[PDB]
């Protein structure tokens, strides 16, 4: 029948992005060695890796003292870091590093004398690969001049020492003729952009924005993220925050979050915190500058006990992302549907099939599934047994007929139906 395409380590789950480590685990303990009690927590969401913030020593805007080969001593020391990498494989969670030299100036790439900067990061690839870490990340490559010609050898060396590494690039330009002009010959790298950033006032362009991208890409493997370094909630309403992790997980790509968005952390309505890096609220002792803006349910220790949270969803949607086979590497078919929603399917011949129906409206629309276009190897049955619903009030386990479905307003769905063919 079918011989399985090979599985690498990062199709099999989720990433995680941390910008400011001192902001992640709370104040004071801004050490690399501090985030080792937290790695038991990150294996609750079961992400299959994380990218760690830029810890190389870097005087702001200074060329001669900006060295990618040693840790900025605010964060700890180099021998602290090998205790981090060794302890992380106790939970099978990879580590990736930033390699943008400037990250305290505005332009993050030192636009004057470009080639010496790339020459600096070219040597920096070899030392960290011999240091045992696996994967890098560059941001704002459009600030770098001629970024495609330099993207080759950085891909080449991280494929050189092994082929189980990773090389993530980033950009901001959301035009498709710039985006796939990077992926045209450079195919074995992930990329994150601001392509899905510009929502058309609560998601009017989204059902086109997934499909046009997923068609023009030639069905490679890509990566799904709102932006390269910012949170989820700095673009969206807080009412759509349960209808994107449903979409960002079951799409065919690599889910790239940031930190704190498994709470749905709000950078707004928190004063004194910057736009790039709020603090993550482990319990009530995470923000003592003001006791007022921190509620009870905006914390981990508020949502870890309620099953109808956002985190309790996120502990049962990433779990379905890494486990079931069709959501891993399956095939994606988005059939036509009603006026103001978006829906698709994922199939893998004899495995389970997962039916997704979303609701980007604001009303109580009834779901008109008007498919008629699928192959008969994967087409609609009568009933589906309703795996997951983003809003409480239904069964999550009952078989429901499809053409009398009656979605609630702003509710997406996860429907699981067997082969039966």
């Amino acid at each position, epitope marked *: 029948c079918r011989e399985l395409p090979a599985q690498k380590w990062w199709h099999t789950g989720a990433l995680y992005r941390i910008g400011d480590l001192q902001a992640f685990q709370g104040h004071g303990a801004g050490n690399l060695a501090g985030l080792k009690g937290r790695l038991d927590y990150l294996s609750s969401l079961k992400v299959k890796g994380l990218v760690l913030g830029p810890i190389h020593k870097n005087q702001k805007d200074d060329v001669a003292q900006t060295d990618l080969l040693q840790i900025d001593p605010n964060f700890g020391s180099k021998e602290d870091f090998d205790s981090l990498l060794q302890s992380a494989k106790k939970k099978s969670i990879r580590v990736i590093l930033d390699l943008t030299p400037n990250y305290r100036g505005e332009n993050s790439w030192f636009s004057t004398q470009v080639d010496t900067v790339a020459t600096k990061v070219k040597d920096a690839l070899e030392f960290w690969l011999q240091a045992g870490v696996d994967g890098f990340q560059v941001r704002d490559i459009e600030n770098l001049k001629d970024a495609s010609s330099f993207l080759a050898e950085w891909q080449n060396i991280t494929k050189g020492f092994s082929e189980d590494r990773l090389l993530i690039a980033g950009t901001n330009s959301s035009d498709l003729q710039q985006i796939l002009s990077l992926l045209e010959s450079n195919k074995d790298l992930l990329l994150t952009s601001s392509y899905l950033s510009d929502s058309g006032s609560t998601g009017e362009h989204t059902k086109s924005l997934v499909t046009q991208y997923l068609n023009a890409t030639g069905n490679r493997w890509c990566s799904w993220s709102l932006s390269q370094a910012r949170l989820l909630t700095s673009f969206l309403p807080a009412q759509l925050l349960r209808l994107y992790q449903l979409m960002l997980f079951t799409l065919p790509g690599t889910p790239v979050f940031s930190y704190g968005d498994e709470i749905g952390l709000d950078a707004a309505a928190l*004063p*004194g*915190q*910057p*736009m790039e890096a709020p603090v993550m609220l482990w*319990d*009530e*002792s995470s923000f*003592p*500058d*003001i*006791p*007022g*803006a921190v509620s009870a349910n905006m914390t981990v220790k508020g949502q870890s006990e309620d099953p109808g949270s956002l985190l309790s969803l996120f502990r049962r949607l990433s779990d379905q992302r890494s486990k079931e086979r069709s959501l891993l590497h399956g095939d994606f078919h988005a059939f036509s549907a009603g006026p103001g929603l978006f829906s698709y399917i994922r199939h893998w011949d004899q495995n389970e099939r997962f039916l997704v129906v979303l609701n980007f409206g604001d009303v109580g629309l009834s779901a008109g599934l008007q498919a008629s276009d699928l192959p008969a190897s994967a087409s609609l049955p009568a009933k589906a047994d309703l795996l997951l619903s983003t809003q409480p009030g239904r069964e999550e386990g009952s078989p429901l007929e499809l053409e009398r479905l009656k979605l609630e307003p702003h509710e997406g769905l996860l429907l699981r139906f067997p082969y039966a063919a």
Partner: antibody
Framework: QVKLLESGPGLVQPSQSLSITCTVS????????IHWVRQPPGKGLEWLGV???????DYNAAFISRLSITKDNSKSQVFFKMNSLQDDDTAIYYC?????????????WGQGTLVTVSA | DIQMTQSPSSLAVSVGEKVTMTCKSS????????????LAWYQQKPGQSPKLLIF???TRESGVPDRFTGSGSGTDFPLTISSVKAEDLAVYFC????????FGGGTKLEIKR
């Protein structure tokens, strides 16, 4: 030391614009926030928005975007811009400062500026 | 949003005696992970913009004589003056930290003579 002095126009007409520049003399802005607090005379104090050390800007709940406070560390000037003034906003407008991160107002400018709105 | 109901509108007390300035609010001011309650008091001399007196509901700022000290816990708290001088004639404020919309109102001190 901690020394303030600000530059207000004194009086502008109803439904007009305003510009108050607090020139902080002696201490750098980038570790201490700067509020603004208004006072109609003989009455209580009412908050206006802060500018933190980063560039994060807040406002009050009573008006989210009537106000526009911009900080510029070029000449240690903290710009203030309020639009659509009325005669019900004649008040003392003055600069302020917090204790490092929380809201203990360590000083104020001891003079302030008394602005009134009339034709 | 918290509001700070201060109890006396004004108070008239001759020199050397003891007064109580209290304030009442809606919520519990004691952030329970600490044991402190978030609070301040201000002294507006006439013609001048005010200055600090007390932070964290019971301390002193550096350079303020110890006739004034604050007590109270939870929602209701006084100031108390252990003896009143002649220069201490002013307007006293209750102002807020806990939620981010912060303020209260001002009472008046007058003196018998």
């Amino acid at each position: 030391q901690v020394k303030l002095l600000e530059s207000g126009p004194g009086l502008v007409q109803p439904s007009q614009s305003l510009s108050i520049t607090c020139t902080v003399s002696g201490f750098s802005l980038t570790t201490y926030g700067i509020h603004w607090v208004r006072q109609p005379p003989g009455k209580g104090l009412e908050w206006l928005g802060v500018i933190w050390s980063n560039g994060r800007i807040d406002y009050n709940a009573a008006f989210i975007s009537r106000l526009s406070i911009t900080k510029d560390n070029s000449k240690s000037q903290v710009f203030f811009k309020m639009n659509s003034l009325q005669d019900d906003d004649t008040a003392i407008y003055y600069c302020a400062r917090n204790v490092y991160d929380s809201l203990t107002w360590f000083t104020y400018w001891g003079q302030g500026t008394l602005v009134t709105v009339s034709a | 949003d918290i509001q700070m109901t201060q109890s006396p509108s004004s108070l008239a007390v001759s020199v050397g005696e003891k007064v109580t300035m209290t304030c009442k609010s809606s919520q519990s001011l004691l952030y329970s992970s600490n044991q402190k309650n978030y609070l301040a008091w201000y002294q507006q001399k006439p013609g001048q913009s005010p200055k600090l007196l007390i932070f964290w509901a019971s301390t002193r700022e550096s350079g303020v004589p110890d006739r004034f000290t604050g007590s109270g816990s939870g929602t209701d708290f006084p100031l108390t003056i252990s003896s009143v001088k002649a220069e201490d004639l002013a307007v006293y404020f209750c102002q807020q930290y806990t939620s981010y919309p912060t303020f209260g109102g001002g009472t008046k001190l007058e003196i018998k003579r």
